[PDB]
Amino acid sequence: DSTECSNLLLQYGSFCTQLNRALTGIAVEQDKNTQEVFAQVKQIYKTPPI
Amino acid sequence: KDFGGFNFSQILPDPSKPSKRSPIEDLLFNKVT
Amino acid sequence: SALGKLQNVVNQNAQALNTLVKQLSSNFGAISSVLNDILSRLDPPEAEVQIDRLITGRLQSLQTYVTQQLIRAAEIRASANLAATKMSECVLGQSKRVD
Amino acid sequence: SALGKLQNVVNQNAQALNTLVKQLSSNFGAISSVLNDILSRLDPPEAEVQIDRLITGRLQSLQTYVTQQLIRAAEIRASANLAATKMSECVLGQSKRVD
Amino acid sequence: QCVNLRTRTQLPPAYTNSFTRGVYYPDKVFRSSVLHSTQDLFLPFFSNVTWFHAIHKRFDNPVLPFNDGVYFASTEKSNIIRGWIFGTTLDSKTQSLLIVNNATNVVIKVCEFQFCNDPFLGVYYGVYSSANNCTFEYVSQPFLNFKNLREFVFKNIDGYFKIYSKHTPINLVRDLPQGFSALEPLVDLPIGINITRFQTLLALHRSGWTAGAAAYYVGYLQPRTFLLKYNENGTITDAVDCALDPLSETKCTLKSFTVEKGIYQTSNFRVQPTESIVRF
Amino acid sequence: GTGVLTESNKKFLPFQQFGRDIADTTDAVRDPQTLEILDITPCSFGGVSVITPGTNTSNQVAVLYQGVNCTEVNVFQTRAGCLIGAEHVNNSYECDIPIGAGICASYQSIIAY
Amino acid sequence: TNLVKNKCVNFNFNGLTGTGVLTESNKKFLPFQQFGRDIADTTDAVRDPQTLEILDITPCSFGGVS
Amino acid sequence: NGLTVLPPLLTDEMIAQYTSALLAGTITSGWTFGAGPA
Numbered sequence: 001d002s003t004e005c006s007n008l009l010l011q012y013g014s015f016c017t018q019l020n021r022a023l024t025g026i027a028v029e030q031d032k033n034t035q036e037v038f039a040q041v042k043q044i045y046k047t048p049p050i
Numbered sequence: 051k052d053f054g055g056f057n058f059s060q061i062l063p064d065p066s067k068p069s070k071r072s073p074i075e076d077l078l079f080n081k082v083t
Numbered sequence: 084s085a086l087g088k089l090q091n092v093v094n095q096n097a098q099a100l101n102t103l104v105k106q107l108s109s110n111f112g113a114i115s116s117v118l119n120d121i122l123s124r125l126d127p128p129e130a131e132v133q134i135d136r137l138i139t140g141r142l143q144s145l146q147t148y149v150t151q152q153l154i155r156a157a158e159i160r161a162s163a164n165l166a167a168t169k170m171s172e173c174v175l176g177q178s179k180r181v182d
Numbered sequence: 183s184a185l186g187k188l189q190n191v192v193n194q195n196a197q198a199l200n201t202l203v204k205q206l207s208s209n210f211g212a213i214s215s216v217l218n219d220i221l222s223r224l225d226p227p228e229a230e231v232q233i234d235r236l237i238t239g240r241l242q243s244l245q246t247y248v249t250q251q252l253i254r255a256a257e258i259r260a261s262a263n264l265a266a267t268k269m270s271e272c273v274l275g276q277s278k279r280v281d
Numbered sequence: 282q283c284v285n286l287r288t289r290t291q292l293p294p295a296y297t298n299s300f301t302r303g304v305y306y307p308d309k310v311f312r313s314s315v316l317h318s319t320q321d322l323f324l325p326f327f328s329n330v331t332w333f334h335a336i337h338k339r340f341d342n343p344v345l346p347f348n349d350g351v352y353f354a355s356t357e358k359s360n361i362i363r364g365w366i367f368g369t370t371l372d373s374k375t376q377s378l379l380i381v382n383n384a385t386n387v388v389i390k391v392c393e394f395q396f397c398n399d400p401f402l403g404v405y406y407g408v409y410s411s412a413n414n415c416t417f418e419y420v421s422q423p424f425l426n427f428k429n430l431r432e433f434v435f436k437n438i439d440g441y442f443k444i445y446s447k448h449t450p451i452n453l454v455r456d457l458p459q460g461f462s463a464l465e466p467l468v469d470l471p472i473g474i475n476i477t478r479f480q481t482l483l484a485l486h487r488s489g490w491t492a493g494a495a496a497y498y499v500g501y502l503q504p505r506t507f508l509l510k511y512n513e514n515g516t517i518t519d520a521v522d523c524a525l526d527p528l529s530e531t532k533c534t535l536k537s538f539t540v541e542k543g544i545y546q547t548s549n550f551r552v553q554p555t556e557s558i559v560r561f
Numbered sequence: 562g563t564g565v566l567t568e569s570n571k572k573f574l575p576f577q578q579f580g581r582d583i584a585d586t587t588d589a590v591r592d593p594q595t596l597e598i599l600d601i602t603p604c605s606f607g608g609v610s611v612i613t614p615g616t617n618t619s620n621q622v623a624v625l626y627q628g629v630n631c632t633e634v635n636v637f638q639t640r641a642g643c644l645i646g647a648e649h650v651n652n653s654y655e656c657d658i659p660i661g662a663g664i665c666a667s668y669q670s671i672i673a674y
Numbered sequence: 675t676n677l678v679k680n681k682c683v684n685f686n687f688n689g690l691t692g693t694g695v696l697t698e699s700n701k702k703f704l705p706f707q708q709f710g711r712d713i714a715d716t717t718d719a720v721r722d723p724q725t726l727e728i729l730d731i732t733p734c735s736f737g738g739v740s
Numbered sequence: 741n742g743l744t745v746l747p748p749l750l751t752d753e754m755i756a757q758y759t760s761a762l763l764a765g766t767i768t769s770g771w772t773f774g775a776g777p778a
């Protein structure tokens with residue numbers, strides 16, 4: 001929460017934006033991975049009761 | 051182009067185009083900027 | 084140890100996060116690892132030097148964590164692509180590919 | 183949004199180049215982001231320190247760019263290996279592999 | 282010479298909407314067909330700006346705090362508004378800035394003036410009593426139903442006084458028109474003095490006195506980020522206030538005026554501390 | 562420091578004043594005047610995300626505060642966070658804009674489902 | 675000094691210094707503007723202070739020698 | 741400390757539902773559901 005630290009950190013440019021962008025890319029990639037593996041059917045099939 | 055009714059004009063190269071691309075390939079190259 | 088492959092991923096992620104937060108407790112050559120202590124103990128001309136040391140240390144730690152996460156994400160993406168291929172070719176069909 | 187996969191690669195490369203250019207406008211704790219201004223406003227004993235700050239900031243930016251380019255290169259290489267496999271197995275033959 | 286005006290009619294000040302006005306060029310740099318995000322003292326979009334009238338008996342010449350900058354909007358006909366009063370204490374103790382436009386030229390002076398309580402000019406069909414120590418004088422070319430719209434931005438940054446201005450031909454009767462017009466930089470003054478208060482200068486019409494029909498608006502500049510759009514010819518045609526609403530915040534984050542469908546992480550939320558607790 | 566102080570169930574030894582977690586951050590403290598234990602949860606931190614359709618379609622937006630309870634910020638509580646500006650419906654549709662934890666948003670006003 | 679165009683020279687215009695090729699420009703500046711920037715915030719257009727004309731600053735032909 | 745954990749888009753129940761659908765398809769329909777109608 002230090003405002004002096006953030007003022008000094010703004011001198012380094014867009015490093016923080018790059019790190020946030022990379023983490024966001026990884027985060028959406030995980031959902032894409034689960035979507036690719038498990039959602040291979042668009043119909044929810046059900047077994048017969050017997 | 052007698053292939054028993056099968057048409058490949060959209061994927062074969064177009065002689066009219068100077069780039070010698072197919073219509074699909076020409077559309078793909080136009081749609082990427 | 085049947086489910087070690089998933090447990091390794093969970094353990095690596097938790098260990099990387101734990102090391103990333105542990106890096107905040109290091110002063111990186113400054114007088115203290117706490118920004119509040121530097122702001123309360125020093126004038127701004129020397130405080131800028133102390134926060135500059137802490138900022139470069141913490142930024143290096145965060146960049147290292149993000150790079151490791153990107154490499155692990157690439158490995159997990161390769162594993163997930165393999166799993167999707169197995170789902171298509173072993174579950175949704177019969178595969179002639181040996182092993 | 184049909185050709186989003188190629189557009190993402192083009193956008194990522196252009197955005198990485200733009201970020202690498204925009205990192206030159208940051209002083210990284212020095213008095214100015216311009217080397218000429220530092221060399222004209224200060225004597226070489228302190229201009230050496232300010233130029234050193236600019237050098238370490240720009241070197242860190244360039245290392246970050248090269249590292250993320252290497253990771254993206256690994257991803258593109260995996261995609262190209264998949265594309266070569268599809269060229270061999272789907273175009274040059276009929277594949278029994280499901281999906 | 283000073284004259285008290287004792288024939289005023291009491292009325293509360295008005296308020297109105299800023300819409301998308303008050304934008305100016307942040308620098309002297311040409312930009313072509315590009316979107317630029319800048320952090321500067323800007324006027325907030327759709328803000329509450331104070332509205333003052335001059336009509337007949339209304340004669341609105343108060344002294345207002347300058348704050349970090351002043352946006353002055355003028356719906357003017359027949360040139361009643363002639364200049365401004367800038368200073369801290371508005372007396373001979375400190376040094377004050379005078380901007381006047383009389384019938385011939387514009388005069389900018391930084392001196393120790395003795396301001397009147399009610400300063401004004403007069404046209405037939407008294408603003409100071411003394412001037413002791415002058416440090417800067419600058420005479421320039423004249424800047425100038427309601428027919429004229431005059432936008433001005435005054436800023437005190439690093440001892441520099443920036444005056445931005447724009448002339449707009451309008452034909453609206455009462456309120457501010459809705460539109461976009463970026464203010465060009467007109468003049469930078471090397472004054473190097475403290476200014477915390479200002480006062481408009483009007484002109485009387487004599488045939489007692491009569492106040493000509495004029496209306497003006499005061500807005501206050503706040504530190505914020507704008508996303509400015511530069512066309513092919515290099516004029517600012519549209520702007521985005523990054524702190525107005527989440528949609529414009531997304532536009533500011535993605536550096537585009539058009540946002541595709543999806544979810545976009547734009548900012549962060551932090552609870553602010555309400556109190557400070559000491560336990561010893 | 563800055564944090565929310567809550568009553569704690571931890572039992573400190575009499576020589577102990579504060580407590581550290583796995584990450585060596587102070588998660589519990591003893592008040593020096595009244596000897597009681599207090600947890601120090603950090604103040605809520607969230608990622609503010611904007612859910613919108615295309616600007617060609619509409620200018621309506623919804624705000625997602627990630628990992629933030631709705632009591633500390635059309636208000637709906639999801640596991641992903643607090644969603645303001647989206648009308649929650651009981652009908653199920655295909656996912657248009659992903660929110661998370663099974664929640665997706667769409668435009669039809671902006672609905673969440 | 676005199677102005678030299680179409681050559682990789684060291685330019686110093688009103689305190690803004692650099693190295694580039696100064697060619698004639700078709701960009702019409704507004705009268706209050708002095709310098710010109712591209713998307714990447716690099717000075718690619720400038721106004722001569724003596725005579726109010728617009729000059730493009732093309733970067734000198736750097737290259738890799740293989 | 742700036743650290744947040746985002747939940748996955750697909751919950752464990754929906755992933756279990758997807759696996760159940762795949763199991764029902766491969767039990768009742770063979771490989772036909774993966775190449776067209778079940």
Ligand SMILES: *[C@@H]1O[C@H](CO)[C@@H](O[C@@H]2O[C@H](CO)[C@@H](O)[C@H](O)[C@H]2NC(C)=O)[C@H](O)[C@H]1NC(C)=O
Nearest residue numbers: 051052053054055056057058059060061064073
């Ligand atoms: C193969 O397909 C192409 C295009 O799908 C056919 O070309 C069309 O021919 C008709 C009549 O001959 C014209 O009216 C269309 O304008 C043509 N379209 C285009 C895109 O050129 C072509 O006739 C088909 N058959 C063969 C043997 O080439």
Ligand SMILES: *[C@@H]1O[C@H](CO)[C@@H](O[C@@H]2O[C@H](CO)[C@@H](O)[C@H](O)[C@H]2NC(C)=O)[C@H](O)[C@H]1NC(C)=O
Nearest residue numbers: 282283284285286287372396397398399400407
């Ligand atoms: C116009 O009115 C103002 C306000 O009353 C006058 O200013 C006052 O002048 C008296 C003169 O003895 C002073 O004692 C007061 O201290 C002044 N007030 C303030 C707030 O400074 C002003 O003199 C009047 N003008 C004329 C010409 O009489």
Ligand SMILES: *[C@@H]1O[C@H](CO)[C@@H](O)[C@H](O)[C@H]1NC(C)=O
Nearest residue numbers: 295296297298327328329330
């Ligand atoms: C502007 O402020 C006045 C009081 O200062 C208030 O009555 C009015 O409603 C405000 N206008 C807007 C649009 O907020």
Ligand SMILES: *[C@@H]1O[C@H](CO)[C@@H](O)[C@H](O)[C@H]1NC(C)=O
Nearest residue numbers: 381382383384385386387388
């Ligand atoms: C306007 O003011 C200037 C300086 O104050 C003066 O020289 C000039 O005569 C004035 N003109 C008129 C018409 O009052």
Ligand SMILES: *[C@@H]1O[C@H](CO)[C@@H](O)[C@H](O)[C@H]1NC(C)=O
Nearest residue numbers: 373374393411412413414415
């Ligand atoms: C300012 O003016 C007063 C009165 O005219 C004079 O006594 C004083 O010396 C002046 N100060 C300066 C710095 O000129």
Ligand SMILES: *[C@@H]1O[C@H](CO)[C@@H](O)[C@H](O)[C@H]1NC(C)=O
Nearest residue numbers: 368369370474475476477478
């Ligand atoms: C400027 O004037 C205001 C009010 O008179 C005062 O509070 C402030 O300290 C002054 N600033 C300087 C730098 O003198």
Ligand SMILES: *[C@@H]1O[C@H](CO)[C@@H](O)[C@H](O)[C@H]1NC(C)=O
Nearest residue numbers: 511512513514515516518702
């Ligand atoms: C830009 O200027 C040219 C002439 O210089 C004009 O034809 C064109 O309409 C202008 N563009 C816009 C958007 O006003």
